Amino acid sequence: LNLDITIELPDREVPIRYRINRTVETKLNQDITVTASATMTILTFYNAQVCNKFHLNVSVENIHALMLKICTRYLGEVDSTMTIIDISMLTGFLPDAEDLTRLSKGVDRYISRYEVDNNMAQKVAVIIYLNKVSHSEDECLHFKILKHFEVGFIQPGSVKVYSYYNLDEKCTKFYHPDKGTGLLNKICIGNVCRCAGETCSSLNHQERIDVPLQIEKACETNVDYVYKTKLLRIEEQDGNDIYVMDVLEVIKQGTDENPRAKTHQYISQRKCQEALNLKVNDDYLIWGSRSDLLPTKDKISYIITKNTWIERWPHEDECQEEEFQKLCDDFAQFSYTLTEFGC
């Protein structure tokens, strides 16, 4: 072989040469031009578009304390050997030791040593080892889960089922006393998601605005923008509800120091139609956080969360009635003094 090569890339502005008497990598999907004067291979990876091994059913029902109930079945042709049920406790929850100890002495079972305080197994992650899980009928176990400490927001727990000859394939379920599915609540459009909180944020009323106390609210850390908006139309994209709104006035401006030139989207789950009583062509007082922003199109879009304050702003038609009139002033003072002075 007495070669002399040269490769052309739309990528590189100058082509590459190498005397074959070898590799180069790009980040593009383009035509190549080769020149000789040997074999070549080209590779092009791209991203092209649950529980195959076990059936896993985990519920937590109420004891009229909670009863944790687990049901599983192997989907294989033959009973699985040496399967494992990996369990985590809800926050501030602990296993009833008496129950767990009954399960522990089961013919085909094992659980690690645990300490006990007042019938409470001192373990937040409990793992039960079974010799076999049936492939033909469901297998179930249950025990009581005891509330040790009270808490605001319980974190959901999880159950994993896997066997010796399939460790990498793990089937996971979450459980919460409130959210059946135990999944953290979130909103997605197309493919991008943001947190939602779970608690469904209701509309505000609001009879006499404490203008000093409201500036205080609209001035805390987490409040990045304060607009007056107009509900142009309500729609439903991927995420059940899209509230199309137009910024009438800008009272406080976010890091993106430039709104009003782009129509805003406010997004909430269909489970939240009731409490957010938004009507078309009604004016709204809106403020929130820029951590609630969800990127799309040319359009600017946020999702309705508890960091979002929503209050209906009457029209001028409205601003003559004995009920609405003292508030319209309240809204005028608020706007004025915030826009003129800042925090």
Partner: protein, 215 residues
Amino acid sequence: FIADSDIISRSDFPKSWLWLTKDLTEEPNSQGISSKTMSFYLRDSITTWVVLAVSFTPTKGICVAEPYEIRVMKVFFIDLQMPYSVVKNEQVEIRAILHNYVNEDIYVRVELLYNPAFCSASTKGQRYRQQFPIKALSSRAVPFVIVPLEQGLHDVEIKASVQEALWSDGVRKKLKVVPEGVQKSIVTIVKLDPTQLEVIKARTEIETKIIIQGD
């Protein structure tokens, strides 16, 4: 409970370091042996370090010393075991485990720092914290449920201080988050070279490897 402003979370966990070379230009003793004292600081990892020294000497060839170990520990600390990678938008649970190595009974505050890249218990306002006890010479598992919302490396940070004492610990480890799909692999062609030329037209980020061989 000392402020989390005080505890600076450990984060420097190299899998290897001290890649240096070194001349024994010192003078030999009675024994004909030269000696070289050297200083360095340890990194953040709680583990044992093995230090291997291999030397070359013009008339004495090459020599591989016996390994020298360095145990690095704490009295109380966090151990965060992370998966290699996780898929965007999929809910997972990570288990930090707290170790109490003192022979007493302690009471502990564990807080998981918020991050905008995740969806978790921790919100911007307040970090999901919890208090509970640990028995003599024992340890306790702590689950955290997060949901990755961005691809890439994104820190997970956990901090814990004991009560009525000065023992604390913080860990910061980068979590790998990957595209929602399955990576698909096209060998665009296999051509040969019998001046000859050839155009190969166009066929989630993308890579393209270019292999030409001799035969």
